């Protein structure tokens, strides 16, 4: 009778903190393993192959366009991922957005993850890159729905990292349930039989 749930939390177990030291000046901000920007690219492709799972349902094929929880579509049809990586725009190029020199970096990826943790819905993050921070479907991304294992307040310790796949109910209407369950099954082999030494994943399709 709610939404359904496919859902990943994903752990960096091999990655090791690291400082961002902010320019010109600022106070020294630690970053937990899985905010390393090479991991956040890997997941961020992890997730784009989730999105384009297709499963096979007698003669049909289901995509994940298909079943999944689009509240602003027809107008805006992209499905609804709670991910850090939103904050990104689900981009590899936003991801490496930086203003730099050959010496100094004044704003890159930790800047606008700092900043859009604390106001997710902002359509420009107030820095040199001027990047939304709005999720792809419209919508805001709260820090404490996709990130765990910090500490109070502190997003950027997280130590995991959670991506939220909402799917539509389909209450009262079981044709369509059936080629929804069809693609979570597809999921989870998917999943199951993804092993990235860099992640550890734990992953979950509704009952």
Same mark, same amino acid.
């Given at each position: 009778?709610?939404?359904? %749930?496919? $859902?990943? #939390?994903?752990? =960096? @177990? !091999?990655?090791?903190?690291?400082?961002?030291?902010?320019?010109? &000046?600022?106070?020294?901000?630690?970053?937990?393993?899985?905010?390393?920007?090479?991991?956040?690219?890997?997941?961020?492709?992890?997730?784009?192959?989730?999105?384009?799972?297709?499963?096979?349902?007698?003669?049909?094929?289901? %995509?994940? $366009?298909? #079943?999944?929880? =689009? @509240? !602003?579509?027809?107008?805006?049809?992209?499905?609804?991922?709670? &991910?850090?990586?939103?904050?990104?725009?689900?981009?590899?190029?936003?991801?490496?957005?930086?203003?730099?020199?050959?010496?100094?970096?004044?704003?890159?990826?930790?800047?606008?993850?700092?900043?859009?943790?604390?106001?997710?819905?902002?359509?420009?993050?107030?820095?040199?890159?001027?990047?939304?921070?709005?999720?792809?479907?419209?919508?805001?991304?709260?820090?404490?729905?996709?990130?765990?294992?910090?500490?109070?307040?502190?997003?950027?310790?997280?130590?995991?990292?959670?991506?939220?796949?909402?799917?539509?109910?389909?209450?009262?209407?079981?044709?369509?349930?059936?080629?929804?369950?069809?693609?979570?099954?597809?999921?989870?082999?998917?999943?199951?039989?993804?092993?990235?030494?860099?992640?550890?994943?734990?992953?979950?399709?509704?009952?």
């Amino acid at each position: 009778p709610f939404f359904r %749930t496919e $859902q990943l #939390i994903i752990r =960096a @177990p !091999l990655t090791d903190k690291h400082i961002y030291q902010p320019y010109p &000046s600022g106070a020294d901000v630690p970053f937990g393993p899985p905010l390393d920007i090479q991991i956040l690219h890997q997941v961020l492709d992890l997730q784009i192959a989730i999105e384009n799972i297709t499963a096979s349902y007698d003669n049909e094929t289901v %995509t994940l $366009q298909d #079943i999944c929880l =689009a @509240p !602003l579509s027809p107008y805006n049809t992209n499905c609804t991922i709670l &991910s850090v990586l939103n904050y990104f725009q689900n981009s590899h190029s936003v991801l490496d957005h930086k203003k730099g020199d050959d010496f100094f970096v004044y704003a890159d990826y930790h800047t606008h993850f700092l900043y859009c943790v604390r106001a997710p819905a902002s359509l420009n993050d107030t820095s040199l890159l001027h990047d939304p921070c709005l999720g792809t479907f419209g919508g805001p991304v709260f820090p404490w729905l996709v990130l765990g294992g910090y500490d109070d307040q502190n997003y950027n310790n997280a130590t995991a990292l959670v991506i939220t796949f909402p799917v539509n109910n389909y209450y009262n209407d079981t044709e369509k349930l059936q080629r929804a369950q069809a693609w979570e099954k597809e999921f989870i082999n998917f999943v199951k039989n993804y092993k990235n030494p860099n992640l550890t994943i734990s992953f979950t399709a509704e009952r």
